[PDB]
C-alpha cells in the first residue's frame, strides 16, 4: 500500500523562488503569484530543519538589499529639508517591504520565529539591518540629529516645518534606540541653552 | 467585609466509608460510598459498578449504615454528619425521576461533651430497634426506631466507662445488647450492656467484663449461628460468646495493625481484615455441630491502604481507600504464583491526602496545571491535573509532513466516508482505511501528480478534488472525470474553498465562482480585488435550499476579513484588523444561535462575530489569543452541534456552552490538520495530523479534569518547580524497618543517580527522607538525595537568593529522635541541580525544626521552631541571619507578598509581619487573637488573608481599616468541611479577581476568588433563594452547614458564597428558576452563573 513520493524537485526549486521573491518584494519588483502562492510555497517547502538555513538564505538576500540602500546615504549634502525626506522615504520603503515579506514569511514566524524565540524577528532583523547600514554608524546619524535639532529649533522660533517629518523621524529615533540611548541629550542640551537665552532675554 | 467565592474544582475522592445493601431496590445489590460530602450510589452488576445516583450532603458523612425496619421493602440509610445531623434516607425511583426522601432527621449534637477520642461511632441494632451513637466521652446516645420518629428524638444513657474504643450490637440477643472495648488504667476490657428503651438505661450484659489484649481496637459482632464478638488487637484475635474464649495470635498480623473489616458471608464464617500496610487478611470461623471451633487468619494478598472494604459478590471486593486509589479487586480461589489471591479489577482515582501542590505552566501554554503530592506511605504519588479534551490514539500511520486530510465515501451507497485523502507537496495519496486497517489504495479520478488544496464529497452523487492546477469533479459510481474546469491563463490556484454544492477558488488577486451541476462544472461570477486572497469560506449553514448565500475574504496589505455577497462578489462589509500578518484561515459556522465568523491572524489571535444572513455585516468584534503558530479551523459535527477545532501548537476545541463561547484545550502536543471521519470501524472520530504521523481518535467533549499518576511508592511531602532546570523537587519519605531495609522499591531507591547527606553538623521502623528531582517532561526520578540518619525534611523551596544567578533547592530539616517531643536540631541545606547531579552548596545548623521556608525578596525566610528569622545569601554563598521574630507558639506556615509576611501559627492562627527594610527588622503589624489552629494560610490581597483552621473552616482576616489597629479582623467565615493542606495562586483555565486553589486531605481541589460588592450581594440573594427552593438530602439547612464551627465557637457564614450552591442554579428546571428569580429576569442569572463556572 501507498508507495512513497519523491521530494527532490521540492527542495531545489525552492531557494531560487526564495531569492526572487525577496528580489520581487524588495525594490517593489512585481510578482506573478499575488503572494499567496508564495505563502503556500513557504508553508509547503519549508519543514523541519528547512527553516534555519532558509532564514540564512532570506536574510543574506535582504541584507545585501539593505546594504545596497547604503550608497545614496553616504553623502556630503547637508539638507535636512531633503536628506531627511530621503531617509524617511527609504524608511517607508523598508517598512512596506518588511511587512510584505512577513505577509509571505508569516509561516516562518508561526513555525520557528514566533514559535521559538531564538532569532531576531523579521521586524528585528530588518530594523537592525536598516539601523546598522543607514542610520547608525554613519555621518547620517550626526547629520540627522543636527538637522532635526535645526527643524525643531526653527520650529521653536515661530514657523511650523513639517509635523509629519518630525513625527516620523522621532519614530525612527525611538524605535532604533536613537531617541533613548544618547540622542535625547542633544535635544535636551540645545533646549537648555536656547530656552535659557529665551528666558533671560524676555525676562 | 470580604467578598469571596468558594467552589469545588475537583470533588473529594477519598472514600471515608462504604456500605453494601439493598438500597435502590429489594433485588439490587448497592454499593454506597461516602466520599467526604458526596454519597455515591452504585449497583453491583455482574461486572464492575454502575453509577445510579450521586448526591451532595450538607455535611461530612461521619456514619453511614443501611438498616431494614420490619415491614420495609428495602434498606433505609442512616447518615450522621460530622456536625451531628442525623437522617434516615430512603431511595424512591419513579421512572426516570430519582429522589432521596428523608424519612427522618434531626440534630443530635449535645450542647456540651468531650467528643470521644476514637471518633464518632454509629451502630444500628441488628433488629433495627435503635441506633446507638457514641459521640462524646461517658455518654451513649440512643435513637429509637420502634417509636417511629420523624425528628429522631434521642436520649443519652450514661456510660460508666469513659474511654470506649469500639462498640457493636451483638446478634441473637432478645434485648439490644452492645459489646464495647474500653480502656481503664488497669488495662483494656470488653464489656456488654443491655439497652432498655423502656427504662432508658443499661442493664447487666449477657457476659461480664473480660480483660483483653492491651491494644484491642476492634469489635466484630458475629451473626446468629455463633453469636458473640471477635475482638481484634495488635497481636491477638479473641472470640467471646460468654463461656467460649477462642484466642489466636497469628504471627502474620503482628507486622501491622488491622483497621477495617467486613463480613464476607451472611453467617460470619469469613471476614476480610484490612491493615494499615495494605495487606488483606481472611479470618475464618470453623463451625462445629452450632458453636465455634477455631479461628484462622490467612493472608489473601495486598490492596490499596483500605479505610473501608466491602465484599460485593463473586469474589469482588471494593477496597475503599482514603490514602490511595480505591480498588475493585477479585479474590481468586487459587494463589497467583506470588502467594496472593487479590487481583485488581478496577481502580478509582483518588487524589489522596494532598499534602502539597504547585501550579506549573508546563508545556509553555497559557494554562495552569496542578502537580500535587498525593497519597501516603505505599500509595504516594504525583498527580498532574489539567482541564482539556482527551482522545484515544487508535489508528496511527507515520507519513511525514502531511498537508491535507479529507473524508471521502468511496462506497457511494453508504453515507460514511470510508476513504481519506492527503496532499503532501505536489501529489495526492489516498487511504482505504478499510475497517480498522489502513493502507494506501487508489480511487480513480484523482491525480497523483498535483498537490490538493481540497477534496471531498459533493452533490449529485459526485466527488470533488481541487488541485494546485485545476479542479476535478469526479462521478463516483461510473468512472473518472466527466467535468473539469481550469484557469484560462492556467495559473495555479493560490487559495480555494468548497462546499457540497458550489465552489469558490481564488486565482491571485481575482476570484472565480463555479457551481456544480451533475456531470458538469459551471462558472458564473468573477471579480478583481485590490490585493491577493488570503483565505475564504463559503460553507452553507442553515442552508435549507442547496446553496450558501455568503462568503468571507481576507486580503493582503489591507488586512481585513471582509464579507461578500455570493452571487455578485460585491463588498457587503470591509473590516480592518491591523498588523502586518496575513490571515491564514477564515471560517463561518453556527454555534446554536446564528452564523458566526472566525478569522485568525498568524499569531493565534481570533475574532468571533455575529453574522447576519441578510446584511452579513460584521459587528461584535472581540478578540481571543490562541497559540503562537498560524492557525486553521475545520469543524466536526458532534452528537449535539458543530464543534470547531483549531490546529496549532496548542490544539483547542471551540464550542459554545449555554450560549457562551468556550475555548477548550486539547491535551495533545501538536496538530497540523484535522478532519472528521465516521467510518464503520470509526464512529464520529477525529483525524489529527502532525509533522510526523496521522493520529486518529475520538473526543468525549465532557471537559473533565484529566489526572495523570506518577507512582512514587513512598509518601511525598513537598513539591516545588525549578523552571530553569526543568524539574520538580519533591520531599519524599519512605519507611524502613530494621541497619535498615526498604520494605519495597520506592521512587527514591529507583532514581537514575543518588546520593546521601554527608554532614559534619550532627555527630521498629524509621522514616528515611529523600529529595527527589523529577523530570518535568517524563516525570522520572532524575536524582534522589537521601538526608541524614534521623533527619526529617519538612520544608522545601526552589529559588535564587541574594545576587548570584543560580537557582537552588533549599530544604529545611529537623533531627527527630524519640527521646524528645519537639526537635532541638535541624539544618537548612542548599542544593543546586546541574549536570544531573545535586551538589550541596551550603548548610546551616539551626536549633529547631524548619517547618517552612519562603523566598522573601531575594532572602530566605525560614521558620525555626517558634522563631521566624530572615537569612541572607552572602557573596560567600552561605546563609547569614538578618532578623528574628519570636512572638509565636509555632510558626508553621509562611506566606509573602511584597514586604509583608503572613505567619500561620499552630494555635495563635495568623500574624501579619512586615520587614521594614529601612531598619532591617520585623514589625508585628496585625494579629488575629482568636485561637484558630491553622492547617494552611494564604494572602489574597494586600489586606485579605485567607486561613484554614483544623476544624474544616475557612476564615478571611483583614487588617482593620490606636493599639486596636494591631488586631486583624475576621471578616470572612465559612465551614468548608474539608481539611485544607495547601493554598496556591493559579488557575487551571486560560467578574472575579484572583484565583487561589487549595488541596485537602479528602482530595478536594477548591477555588477561592474575590468578588465585587455588587456581585456578592446579588449572589448572596440568590443563595438565600436557592436555599428556599433547593431541598437538601437530610433536610439540612445550608446556612447551618456553612456556619463556622469550632468546639468553642459557632458563627454563621459571612463574606463567602458557596459556589457549589450557586452553580447548582443550572441543574433545576425553569419553573424552579422562576421561583428563585421572583424579585431581574432568569436568563440574566443563567448568564451570570455560566460566567461564574468559567473560572474552573
From Swiss-Prot, chain A:
It comes from the Eukaryota. Neddylated; required for activity of cullin-RING-based E3 ubiquitin-protein ligase complexes. Deneddylated via its interaction with the COP9 signalosome (CSN) complex. Can self-associate. Component of multiple DCX (DDB1-CUL4-X-box) E3 ubiquitin-protein ligase complexes that seem to consist of DDB1, CUL4A or CUL4B, RBX1 and a variable substrate recognition component which seems to belong to a protein family described as DCAF (Ddb1- and Cul4-associated factor) or CDW (CUL4-DDB1-associated WD40-repeat) proteins. (Microbial infection) Interacts with Epstein-Barr virus BPLF1. Belongs to the cullin family. Core component of multiple cullin-RING-based E3 ubiquitin-protein ligase complexes which mediate the ubiquitination of target proteins. As a scaffold protein may contribute to catalysis through positioning of the substrate and the ubiquitin-conjugating enzyme. The E3 ubiquitin-protein ligase activity of the complex is dependent on the neddylation of the cullin subunit and is inhibited by the association of the deneddylated cullin subunit with TIP120A/CAND1. The functional specificity of the E3 ubiquitin-protein ligase complex depends on the variable substrate recognition component. This is Cullin-4A. The lineage of its organism: Eukaryota, Metazoa, Chordata, Craniata, Vertebrata. The chain holds residues 49 to 251 of 759 of the full protein.
Swiss-Prot record, chain B:
Its main location: cytoplasm. SUPFAM superfamilies: WD40 repeat-like. Residues 387-703 are annotated as: WD repeat beta-propeller B. Residues 704-1011 are annotated as: WD repeat beta-propeller C. Phosphorylated by ABL1. Ubiquitinated by CUL4A. Subsequently degraded by ubiquitin-dependent proteolysis. InterPro entries: Beta-prop_RSE1/DDB1/CPSF1_1st, Cleavage/polyA-sp_fac_asu_C, RSE1/DDB1/CFT1/CPSF1, WD40/YVTN_repeat-like_dom_sf, WD40_repeat_dom_sf. GO terms for biological process: apoptotic process; biological process involved in interaction with symbiont; cellular response to UV; DNA damage response; DNA repair; ectopic germ cell programmed cell death; epigenetic programming in the zygotic pronuclei; negative regulation of apoptotic process. It is found in: Cytoplasm; Nucleus. Keywords: Acetylation, Biological rhythms, Cytoplasm, Disease variant, DNA damage, DNA repair, DNA-binding, Host-virus interaction, Intellectual disability, Isopeptide bond, Nucleus, Phosphoprotein, Repeat, Ubl conjugation, Ubl conjugation pathway. GO terms for cellular component: chromosome, telomeric region; Cul4-RING E3 ubiquitin ligase complex; Cul4A-RING E3 ubiquitin ligase complex; Cul4B-RING E3 ubiquitin ligase complex; cytoplasm; extracellular exosome; extracellular space; nucleolus. It comes from the Eukaryota. The modification N6-acetyllysine is found at residue 1035. Belongs to the DDB1 family. Protein, which is both involved in DNA repair and protein ubiquitination, as part of the UV-DDB complex and DCX (DDB1-CUL4-X-box) complexes, respectively. Core component of the UV-DDB complex (UV-damaged DNA-binding protein complex), a complex that recognizes UV-induced DNA damage and recruit proteins of the nucleotide excision repair pathway (the NER pathway) to initiate DNA repair. The UV-DDB complex preferentially binds to cyclobutane pyrimidine dimers (CPD), 6-4 photoproducts (6-4 PP), apurinic sites and short mismatches. PANTHER family: DNA REPAIR/RNA PROCESSING CPSF FAMILY. It is linked to White-Kernohan syndrome: An autosomal dominant disorder characterized by global developmental delay, variably impaired intellectual development, hypotonia, and characteristic facial features. Some patients may have genitourinary and skeletal abnormalities. This is DNA damage-binding protein 1. It comes from Homo sapiens.
Amino acid at each position: 500500500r501507498d508507495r512513497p513520493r519523491l521530494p527532490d524537485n521540492y527542495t531545489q526549486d525552492t531557494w531560487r523562488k526564495l531569492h526572487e521573491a525577496v528580489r520581487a518584494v524588495q525594490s517593489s519588483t512585481s510578482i506573478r503569484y499575488n503572494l499567496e502562492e508564495l505563502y503556500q510555497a513557504v508553508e509547503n517547502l519549508c519543514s523541519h530543519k528547512v527553516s534555519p538555513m532558509l532564514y540564512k538564505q532570506l536574510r543574506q538576500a535582504c541584507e545585501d538589499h539593505v546594504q545596497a540602500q547604503i550608497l545614496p546615504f553616504r553623502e556630503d549634502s547637508l539638507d535636512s529639508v531633503l536628506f531627511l525626506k530621503k531617509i524617511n522615504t527609504c524608511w517607508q520603503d523598508h517598512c512596506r517591504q518588511m511587512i510584505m515579506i512577513r505577509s509571505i514569511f508569516l509561516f516562518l514566524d508561526r513555525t520557528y520565529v514566533l514559535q521559538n524565540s531564538t532569532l531576531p524577528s523579521i521586524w528585528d532583523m530588518g530594523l537592525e539591518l536598516f539601523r546598522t547600514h543607514i542610520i547608525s554608524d554613519k555621518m547620517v546619524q550626526s547629520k540627522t540629529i543636527d538637522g532635526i535639532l535645526l527643524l525643531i529649533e526653527r520650529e521653536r522660533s515661530g514657523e511650523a516645518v513639517d509635523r509629519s517629518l518630525l513625527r516620523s523621524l522621532l519614530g525612527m529615533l525611538s524605535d532604533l534606540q536613537v531617541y533613548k540611548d544618547s540622542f535625547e541629550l542633544k535635544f535636551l542640551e540645545e533646549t537648555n541653552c536656547l530656552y535659557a537665552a529665551e528666558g533671560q532675554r524676555l525676562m | 467585609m470580604s467578598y469571596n467565592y468558594v467552589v469545588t474544582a475537583q470533588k473529594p475522592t477519598a472514600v471515608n466509608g462504604c456500605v453494601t445493601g439493598h438500597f435502590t431496590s429489594a433485588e439490587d445489590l448497592n454499593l454506597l460510598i461516602a466520599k467526604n460530602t458526596r454519597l455515591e450510589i452504585y449497583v453491583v452488576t455482574a461486572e464492575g459498578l454502575r453509577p445510579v445516583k450521586e448526591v451532595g450532603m450538607y455535611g461530612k458523612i461521619a456514619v453511614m449504615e443501611l438498616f431494614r425496619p420490619k415491614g420495609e421493602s428495602k434498606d433505609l440509610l442512616f447518615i450522621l454528619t460530622a456536625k451531628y445531623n442525623a437522617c434516615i434516607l430512603e431511595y424512591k425511583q419513579s421512572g426516570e425521576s430519582i429522589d432521596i426522601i428523608t424519612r427522618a432527621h434531626g440534630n443530635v449534637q449535645d450542647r456540651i461533651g468531650r467528643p470521644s477520642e476514637t471518633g464518632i461511632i454509629g451502630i444500628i441494632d441488628p433488629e433495627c430497634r435503635m441506633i446507638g451513637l457514641r459521640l462524646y466521652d461517658g455518654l451513649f446516645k440512643v435513637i429509637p426506631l420502634d417509636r417511629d420518629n420523624k425528628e429522631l428524638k434521642a436520649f443519652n444513657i450514661r456510660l460508666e466507662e469513659l474511654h470506649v474504643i469500639d462498640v457493636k450490637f451483638l446478634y441473637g440477643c432478645q434485648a439490644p445488647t452492645i459489646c464495647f472495648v474500653y480502656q481503664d488504667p488497669q488495662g483494656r476490657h470488653v464489656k456488654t450492656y443491655e439497652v432498655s428503651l423502656r427504662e432508658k438505661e443499661f442493664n447487666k450484659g449477657p457476659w461480664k467484663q473480660e480483660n483483653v489484649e492491651a491494644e484491642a481496637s476492634m469489635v466484630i459482632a458475629v451473626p446468629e449461628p455463633f453469636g458473640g464478638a471477635i475482638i481484634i488487637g495488635q497481636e491477638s484475635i479473641t472470640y467471646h460468646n460468654g463461656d467460649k474464649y477462642l484466642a489466636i495470635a497469628p504471627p502474620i498480623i503482628k507486622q501491622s495493625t488491622i483497621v477495617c473489616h467486613n463480613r464476607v458471608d451472611p453467617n460470619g464464617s469469613r471476614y476480610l481484615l484490612g491493615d494499615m500496610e495494605g495487606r488483606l487478611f481472611m479470618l475464618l470461623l470453623e463451625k462445629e455441630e452450632v458453636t465455634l471451633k477455631d479461628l484462622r487468619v490467612e493472608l489473601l494478598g495486598e490492596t490499596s491502604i483500605a479505610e473501608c472494604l466491602t465484599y460485593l459478590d463473586n469474589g469482588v471486593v471494593f477496597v475503599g481507600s482514603r490514602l490511595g486509589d480505591s480498588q475493585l479487586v477479585k479474590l481468586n480461589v487459587d494463589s497467583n504464583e506470588q502467594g496472593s489471591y487479590v487481583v485488581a479489577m478496577e481502580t478509582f482515582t483518588n487524589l489522596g491526602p494532598i499534602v502539597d501542590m504547585c501550579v506549573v505552566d508546563l508545556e509553555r501554554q497559557g494554562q495552569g496545571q496542578l502537580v500535587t503530592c498525593s497519597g501516603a506511605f505505599k500509595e504516594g504519588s504525583l498527580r498532574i491535573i489539567r482541564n482539556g479534551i482527551g482522545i484515544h490514539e487508535h489508528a496511527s500511520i507515520d507519513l511525514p509532513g502531511i498537508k491535507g486530510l479529507w473524508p471521502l465515501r468511496s462506497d457511494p451507497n453508504r453515507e460514511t466516508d470510508d476513504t481519506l485523502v492527503l496532499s503532501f507537496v505536489g501529489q495526492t495519496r489516498v487511504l482505504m482505511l478499510n475497517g480498522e486497517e489502513v493502507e494506501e489504495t487508489e480511487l480513480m479520478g484523482f491525480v497523483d501528480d498535483q498537490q490538493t488544496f481540497f477534496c471531498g464529497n459533493v452533490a449529485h452523487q459526485q466527488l470533488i478534488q481541487i488541485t494546485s492546477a485545476s479542479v476535478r469533479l469526479v462521478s463516483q459510481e461510473p468512472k473518472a472525470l466527466v467535468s473539469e474546469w481550469k484557469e484560462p491563463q492556467a495559473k495555479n490556484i493560490s487559495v480555494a474553498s468548497c462546499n457540497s454544492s458550489q465552489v469558490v477558488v481564488a486565482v491571485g488577486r481575482a476570484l472565480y465562482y463555479l457551481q456544480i451541476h451533475p456531470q458538469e462544472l459551471r462558472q458564473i461570477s468573477h471579480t478583481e480585488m485590490e490585493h491577493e486572497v488570503a483565505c475564504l469560506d463559503i460553507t452553507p449553514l442553515g442552508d435549507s435550499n442547496g446553496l450558501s448565500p455568503l462568503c468571507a475574504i481576507g486580503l493582503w496589505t489591507d488586512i481585513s476579513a471582509r464579507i461578500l455577497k455570493l452571487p455578485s462578489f460585491e463588498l457587503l462589509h470591509k473590516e480592518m484588523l491591523g498588523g502586518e500578518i496575513i490571515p491564514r484561515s477564515i471560517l463561518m459556522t453556527t454555534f446554536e444561535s446564528s452564523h458566526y465568523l472566525l478569522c485568525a491572524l498568524g499569531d493565534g489571535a481570533l475574532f468571533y462575530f455575529g453574522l447576519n444572513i441578510e446584511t452579513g455585516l460584521l459587528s461584535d468584534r472581540k478578540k481571543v489569543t490562541l497559540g503562537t503558530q498560524p492557525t486553521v479551523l475545520r469543524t466536526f459535527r458532534s452528537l449535539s452541534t458543530t464543534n470547531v477545532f483549531a490546529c496549532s501548537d496548542r490544539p483547542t476545541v471551540i464550542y459554545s456552552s449555554n450560549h457562551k463561547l468556550v475555548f477548550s484545550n486539547v491535551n495533545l502536543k501538536e496538530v497540523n490538520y484535522m478532519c472528521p471521519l465516521n467510518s464503520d470501524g470509526y464512529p464520529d472520530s477525529l483525524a489529527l495530523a502532525n509533522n510526523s504521523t496521522l493520529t486518529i481518535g475520538t473526543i468525549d467533549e465532557i471537559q473533565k479534569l484529566h489526572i495523570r499518576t506518577v507512582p512514587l511508592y513512598e509518601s511525598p511531602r513537598k513539591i516545588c518547580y525549578q523552571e530553569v532546570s526543568q524539574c520538580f523537587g519533591v520531599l519524599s519519605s519512605r519507611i524502613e524497618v530494621q541497619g535498615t531495609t526498604a520494605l519495597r522499591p520506592s521512587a527514591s531507591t529507583q532514581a537514575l543517580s543518588s546520593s546521601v547527606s554527608s554532614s559534619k553538623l550532627f555527630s521498629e521502623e524509621v522514616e528515611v527522607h529523600n529529595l527527589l528531582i523529577i523530570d518535568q517532561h517524563t516525570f522520572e526520578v532524575l536524582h534522589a538525595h537521601q538526608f541524614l540518619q534521623n533527619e526529617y525534611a519538612l520544608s522545601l523551596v526552589s529559588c535564587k537568593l541574594g545576587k548570584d544567578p543560580n537557582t537552588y533547592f533549599i530544604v529545611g530539616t529537623a533531627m527527630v529522635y524519640p527521646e524528645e517531643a519537639e526537635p532541638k536540631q535541624g539544618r537548612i541545606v542548599v542544593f543546586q541541580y546541574s549536570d544531573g547531579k545535586l551538589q550541596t552548596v551550603a548548610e546551616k545548623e539551626v536549633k529547631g525544626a524548619v517547618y517552612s521556608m519562603v523566598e522573601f525578596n531575594g532572602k530566605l525566610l525560614a521558620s525555626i521552631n517558634s522563631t521566624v528569622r530572615l537569612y541572607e545569601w552572602t557573596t560567600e554563598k552561605e546563609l547569614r541571619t538578618e532578623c528574628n521574630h519570636y512572638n509565636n507558639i509555632m510558626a508553621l506556615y509562611l506566606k509573602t507578598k511584597g514586604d509583608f509576611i503572613l505567619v500561620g501559627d499552630l494555635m495563635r492562627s495568623v500574624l501579619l509581619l512586615a520587614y521594614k527594610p529601612m531598619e532591617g527588622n520585623f514589625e508585628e503589624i496585625a494579629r488575629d487573637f482568636n485561637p484558630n489552629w491553622m492547617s494552611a494560610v494564604e494572602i489574597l490581597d494586600d489586606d485579605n488573608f485567607l486561613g484554614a483552621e483544623n476544624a474544616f473552616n475557612l476564615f478571611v482576616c483583614q487588617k482593620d481599616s490606636d493599639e486596636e489597629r494591631q488586631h486583624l479582623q475576621e471578616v470572612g467565615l465559612f465551614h468548608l468541611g474539608e481539611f485544607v493542606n495547601v493554598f496556591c495562586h493559579g488557575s487551571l483555565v486560560m467578574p472575579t479577581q484572583g484565583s487561589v486553589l487549595f488541596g485537602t486531605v479528602n482530595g478536594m481541589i477548591g477555588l477561592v476568588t474575590s468578588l465585587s460588592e455588587s456581585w456578592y450581594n446579588l449572589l448572596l440573594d440568590m443563595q438565600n433563594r436557592l436555599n428556599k427552593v433547593i431541598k437538601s438530602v437530610g433536610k439540612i439547612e445550608h446556612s447551618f452547614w456553612r456556619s463556622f464551627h469550632t468546639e468553642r465557637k459557632t458563627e454563621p457564614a459571612t463574606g463567602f458564597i458557596d459556589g457549589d450552591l450557586i452553580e447548582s442554579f443550572l441543574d433545576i428546571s425553569r419553573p424552579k428558576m422562576q421561583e428563585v428569580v421572583a424579585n431581574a429576569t432568569a436568563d440574566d442569572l443563567i448568564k451570570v452563573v455560566e460566567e461564574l463556572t468559567r473560572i474552573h
